[PDB]
Amino acid sequence: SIQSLKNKLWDESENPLIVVMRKITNKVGGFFAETESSRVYSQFKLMDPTFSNESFTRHLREYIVPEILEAYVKGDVKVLKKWFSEAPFNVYAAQQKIFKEQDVYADGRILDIRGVEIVSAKLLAPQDIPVLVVGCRAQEINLYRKKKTGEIAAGDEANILMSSYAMVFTRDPEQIDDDETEGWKILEFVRG
Amino acid sequence: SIQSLKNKLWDESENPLIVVMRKITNKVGGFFAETESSRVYSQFKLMDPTFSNESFTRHLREYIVPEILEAYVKGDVKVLKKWFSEAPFNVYAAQQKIFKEQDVYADGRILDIRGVEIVSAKLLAPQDIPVLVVGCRAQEINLYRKKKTGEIAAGDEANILMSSYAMVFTRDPEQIDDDETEGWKILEFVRG
């Protein structure tokens, strides 16, 4: 039985939530300490008193989430570069330089982006790095345009998808008065 | 012959350019003085030395045009309210309060917006108000959503139009250090 529970978790992928959940906990050195949340929250608290679930979740849905996703759906390297860890960004820039080879660039535009709720507050084993995992759905229309002022690149019929994102947040007590991002960063971001 | 040239000008509408051209010159008190451009430019010049066709046209395509159109394609009253004269805005807010009655609001998103070129620099008769008429095409996808977190309102199939805009600009030497808009305003804006 729990022999198949493992099957699914390994056979998930579809649910970006559980995909990140994995991506950190399995890829290199992932282990969760069963903090019980409170240690993860009180930890952010120490980092910055003004912190509260409310406080952050709004910042999430009101400015961060909507800000990075738009940055995603288009070739907005400069935006992601301010929120992405060396890990998740570089993997991005990986498909960017490959999408470039095809003389195509990505414009898309997102609409609605509902969801955005923090559902998990656990810390990674390697260094007890307090992490927050947020998930949201975003009705966006994805498109791609070509090299020389070229129409809408490959296909005219770009369906308006309704994707599900899952991302892992973390803050740094060091460099909090950065203003743009101010501590927050993104450890491997995953689209649905 | 020129009996039909009048027919077309009156029978235009399609070409927003010539529609504004009319909208000002005919609706209430419209007459152009054949300034010969230079008087209109030197006039802006006086208003603000830093002024140059180059200078402005960029500001047009780089920040103003793209900024007001996005404000258009969605219910972004606060944006238009900073650029629209009492005339063009109020007419907007006219269809806004009517679109509201139908429990629908407008979200759309614009893409590419090419064109943006100043093709005419003439001044209105009533007060020799120096006006600039800009025109641009904008591949946008128009949509509308409903009253209660309701899908995509009326129709699922929202075609991605490619409209043509024509607008009439004017500046005020008084209130130039406004920063947001800084002098520039919009006299009756017209969509294609």
Q: In what order do the strands lie in the sheet with B129-142?
A: B108-124, B129-142, B163-170, B185-190
Cα–Cα distance, A8 to A188 (Å, whole number): 21
Q: Which amino acid is at A106?
A: A
- How do B129-142 and B104-105 pair as beta strands? unpaired
Residue given tokens 């080879």 in the structure block: A101
Q: Which amino acid is at B112?
A: D
Of residues B111, B114, B149, nearest to A109 (C-beta)? B111
Of residues B109, B145, B149, nearest to A109 (C-beta)? B109
C-alpha closest to that of B131 among B176, B174, B166, B171: B171
Q: Do A111 and B111 touch (CB under 8 A)?
A: no
Q: A40: which residues sit within 8 A by CB, 6+ positions away?
A: A121, A122, A123, A130, A131, A132
Instruction: Please say whether the beta carbons of B44 and B171 come within 8 A.
Output: yes
Rg (CA), chain A: 18
Whether residue A33 lies within 8 A of chain B, CB to CB, comes out as: no
Residues of chain B in contact with residue A141, where contact means CB-CB under 8 angstroms, are: 109, 141
Q: Do B109 and A141 touch (CB under 8 A)?
A: yes
Show which of residues 92-111 on chain B sit within 8 Å of chain A, judged by CB atoms.
Answer: 107, 109, 111
Which of A107, A109, A156, A161 would you mutate first to test chain B, the one with the most B CBs within 10 A? A109
Instruction: Please say whether the beta carbons of A122 and A35 come within 8 A.
Output: yes
Which of A112, A142, A151, A162 would you mutate first to test chain B, the one with the most B CBs within 10 A? A112
Cα–chain-centroid distance for residue B175? 21
Other Cβ atoms within 10 Å of A79 Cβ, number: 16
Cα–Cα distance, A16 to A192 (Å, whole number): 6
3-class DSSP assignment, residue A179 = coil
3-class DSSP assignment, residue B81 = helix
Cα–chain-centroid distance for residue A169? 8
Cα–Cα distance, A177 to A55 (Å, whole number): 17
Instruction: Give chain B's domains with CATH numbers.
Output: 1-192 (3.10.450.240)
3-class DSSP assignment, residue B148 = coil
